Structure 1
Amino acid sequence: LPESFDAREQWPNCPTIKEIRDQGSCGSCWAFGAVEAISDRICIHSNVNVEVSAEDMLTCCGGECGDGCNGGFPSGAWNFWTKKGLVSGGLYNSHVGCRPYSIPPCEHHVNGSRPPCTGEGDTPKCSKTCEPGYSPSYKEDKHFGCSSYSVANNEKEIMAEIYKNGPVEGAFSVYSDFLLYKSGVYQHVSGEIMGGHAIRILGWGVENGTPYWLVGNSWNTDWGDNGFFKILRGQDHCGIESEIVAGMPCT
């Protein structure tokens, strides 16, 4: 395996890999890490480009994935993709796809022009219909996964999975010092625990002798490094290597 790897550069024909979304004032990271990676993989293994609906995942999976805006289970999300499939749907107010995200973007621990985020956000309804004007129907717009699996807590295996099949979803413990991340390789040194956070791992590298994972967060582009961040790799730091999940699209 190479010393560094950036899925954005390796798969130029898949622009979703470079995208950063905004989960808004809702604990839907579990859903975002999943639909983002799934969007990437649909493109990688179908060379079609689809903005997979975070809304569909968040609202219609149900108990199998956890508790909507109150948190969820990454592996459960990929299961939903293989069982019920996912329709398309872009950013809030984009009118792109069957079910665009319904929760407004906000400022995640940074100052900006958008309203500040509020942890208080209710899970939107599961509506099996597409926005007006969109075709085909909800049922016909479903994209299915044909496998859902969990990658072992093994650096090399995780790198191999990304190298061959594309970005994966992962999760780690977020402490307050992570909230102010701006650059460099993140390593937890202080701060109260905020909770578990699901994200998208799209590569790896070494910065100043420090091995890291290239990760895309779902807190918009003005947080961190243009929406992305790097975290220590190889020591299951904050559990970053302990909950890796992925899957392959049908056909």
Structure 2
Amino acid sequence: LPESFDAREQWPNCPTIKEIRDQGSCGSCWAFGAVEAISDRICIHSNVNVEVSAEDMLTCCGGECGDGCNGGFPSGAWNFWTKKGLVSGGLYNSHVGCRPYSIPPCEHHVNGSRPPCTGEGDTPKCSKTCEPGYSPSYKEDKHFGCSSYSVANNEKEIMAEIYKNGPVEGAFSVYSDFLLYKSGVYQHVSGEIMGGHAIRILGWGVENGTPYWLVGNSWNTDWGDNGFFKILRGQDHCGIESEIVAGMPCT
């Protein structure tokens, strides 16, 4: 394994790998880390580009994935992909795909031209129809995963998984000091526990002797380092290596 690895540079034909989404004022990180990585993988292992709908995952998985905007379980999300599949859907108001995200983007712990996130958002309805004008139908726009699995809390195996099969979904404890992250390699030193946060890990590297994981947050691009952040790697910091899940697309 190389000292560094950026899925964005390794798979130039998969632009989803470099894009940052915005979960809005809804605790839907579990769904976002999932559809983002799933999007990357459909592209990696089918070479076709598809914006996997966060809306379909967030609203239709149900109990098997948790409680919608109230939080969910990453592994549960990948299961839904293999069982019910996911339709396409782009950003809020983009009219891209079968089911674009329906929750407005907002400012996540930063000032900007968007409304500030309120964290209090209701889970949207599970509607099995596509936006007007889109084709094919909801049922025919479904993309299925052929396997859902969990990678062990092992730095090397996690790297090998990313190296070989692409970005995976992870989760870690977010403390208040992470909210203000701007650059460098994040290490928890102070702040109250905010809860678990599911995200997308797409690579790793070493910055000034400090090993890290390259992560894509889902708080838009004006948060952190263009929506991404680096986090200490190798010591299960904030449990970043304790809940890695992934899967493979069919055929």
Normalising TM by the smaller chain, what interval? over 0.9
SS of structure 1 residue aligned to 2:98: coil
SS of structure 2 residue aligned to 1:203: strand
Give CA deviations for 1:176-230 in whole Å, capped at 9, x if unaligned.
0000000000000000000000000000000000000000000000000000000
Give CA deviations for 1:94-132 in whole Å, capped at 9, x if unaligned.
000000000000000000000000011000000000000
> Partner residue of 1:86?
86
Output the TM-score relative to the length of structure 2: 1.00
Give CA deviations for 1:145-173 in whole Å, capped at 9, x if unaligned.
00000000000000000000000000000
Displacement of 1:141: 0.1
Residues of 2 paired with 1:150 and 1:112: CA distance? Answer: 37
> Partner residue of 1:234?
234
Residues of 2 paired with 1:119 and 1:17: CA distance? Answer: 26
- List gaps (5 residues or longer) in structure 1: none
Displacement of 1:250: 0.1
- List gaps (5 residues or longer) in structure 2: none
Give CA deviations for 1:6-43 in whole Å, capped at 9, x if unaligned.
00000000000000000000000000000000000000
SS of structure 1 residue aligned to 2:76: helix
> Partner residue of 1:66?
66
Runs of 4+ in structure 1 deviating by more than 2 angstroms, as ranges, are none
Aligned length: 251
Residues of 1 paired with 2:148 and 2:170: CA distance? Answer: 14
Give CA deviations for 1:53-91 in whole Å, capped at 9, x if unaligned.
000000000000000000000000000000000000000
Residues of 2 paired with 1:191 and 1:63: CA distance? Answer: 31
Output the TM-score relative to the length of structure 1: 1.00
Residue identity over aligned pairs, in percent, reads 100
> Partner residue of 2:247?
247
SS of structure 1 residue aligned to 2:156: helix
SS of structure 1 residue aligned to 2:105: coil
